[PDB]
Amino acid sequence: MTVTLNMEKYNFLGISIVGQSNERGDGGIYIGSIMKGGAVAADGRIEPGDMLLQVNDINFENMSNDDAVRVLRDIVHKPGPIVLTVAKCWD
Amino acid sequence: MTVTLNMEKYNFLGISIVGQSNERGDGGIYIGSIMKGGAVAADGRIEPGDMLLQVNDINFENMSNDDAVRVLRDIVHKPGPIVLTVAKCWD
């Protein structure tokens, strides 16, 4: 899924994201929770536990989880459409 | 300095960047070297050892150095002007 998000009619994105790995080092950045308020709740397509692959062409597959947050924060301060590429995970 | 870089007439940016901290944890992301070839050599304003504060509004003050590289890589693949905010360091 690509979920292109409005932002003009909404203002906040409304997700926490989280890092998750096994002891082998495999994992990535996931949708933590979706706030009852924001763009992502409103679009409805993304779910908790889905993997975040990309945001406006910035890849998140190997992002540190503290960078992921501050980088999504910065992108959310850029005015305009926010394009999430997402792997649907089924919980 | 803000150095807004052409990219249409150049193609590659032409810097390596590096992380650097003292034992107290203070430091950041720096210009590693400037390639004799790219946009940054051509613009001429930035120097090795200068600190990278921001790139197209993505803050680099706390970026991990492996994220910094892959994030600058991604931004450099977005077509268009690349805006570097930079602290001049004097070597």
The domain tally of chain A equals 1
3-state secondary structure chain A: CEEEECCCCCCCCCEEEEEEECCCCCEEEEEEEECCCCHHHHHCCCCCCCEEEEECCEECCCCCHHHHHHHHHHHHHCCCCEEEEEECCCC
A58 closest CB neighbour out of B59, B62, B71: B71
- A-B C-beta contacts closer than 8 Å: 40
Chain A, nearest residue to B67 by Cα: A63
Residues A17, A23, A27, A33: what is their CA dihedral angle, to the nearest 10 degrees? Answer: -30
Q: Choose from B52, B54, B69, B70 for mutation: most chain A CBs within 10 A.
A: B70
Q: How far apart are CA B75 and CA B40, in angstroms?
A: 15
Residue-number span of the structural domain to which B8 is assigned: 2-91
Give the CATH number, domain containing residue B70.
2.30.42.10
